[PDB]
Design a protein around this ligand. Structure first.
Ligand SMILES: CCCCCCCCCC(=O)O
Ligand SMILES: [Cl-]
Length: 204
């Protein structure tokens, strides 16, 4: 189904299942009609790959996301957290949060009444909340190009319903369900980065 696992009480997110779940997200970018999204997809997919690579060297040692941060802090010393899977996940979480905010905004019925069949307001909001603070104007220009090329809302919701024979209402209900464990998970990852002093503010 690709619903994320429920958050456990102890909030320790298992790495493997996490990676398996988020790996289903990049394919949704393909359904969009442009190479102009390939930068945002590639980034998320690239960071997933980096984390999986570290995890696969020792799944036991890296069983949870917290384990990754703990182990790599120990391993890399003062270079940490600008290293390894910690750094990849630092960026991944921002792309995941973008998706979260974008989907939640759409589900919540946020829109520009002048352009109700566009998703520019939702993408902008998501971009400003998740990614913009971490991008210089070169990269922001790359992201605007994807904004202006965003699909129509109706076409976007069609792309998500490629399951199928589903109204836009029903589609949105499925998205709201996905958002529950997804949001919780991303929030927990953010909370972890802050707690572990793993968050960096440098721009790319
Ligand atoms: C019900 C699961 C829906 C998952 C949708 C992921 C959408 C990616 C967002 C985007 O392409 O800009
Ligand atoms: Cl419109």
């Amino acid at each position: 189904e690709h619903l994320l696992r429920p958050l456990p009480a102890d909030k320790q997110i298992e790495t493997g299942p996490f990676l398996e779940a988020v790996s289903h997200l990049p394919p949704f970018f393909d359904c969009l009609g442009s190479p102009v999204f390939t930068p945002i997809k590639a980034d998320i997919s690239g960071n997933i790959t980096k984390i999986k690579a570290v995890y696969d060297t020792n799944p036991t040692k890296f069983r949870t996301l917290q384990n990754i941060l703990e182990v790599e802090k120990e391993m890399y010393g003062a270079e940490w957290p600008k290293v390894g899977a910690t750094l990849a996940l630092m960026w991944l979480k921002r792309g995941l949060r973008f998706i979260q905010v974008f989907l939640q905004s759409i589900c919540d019925g946020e829109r520009d009444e002048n352009h109700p069949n566009l998703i520019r307001v939702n993408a902008t909001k998501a971009y400003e909340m998740a990614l913009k603070k971490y991008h210089g104007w070169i990269v922001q220009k790359i992201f605007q190009a994807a904004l202006y090329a965003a699909p129509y809302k109706s076409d976007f919701l069609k792309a998500l319903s490629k399951g199928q024979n589903v109204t836009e209402e029903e589609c949105l209900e499925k998205v709201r369900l996905f958002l529950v464990n997804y949001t919780a998970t991303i929030d927990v990852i953010y909370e972890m980065y802050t707690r572990m002093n793993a968050e960096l503010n440098y721009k790319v």
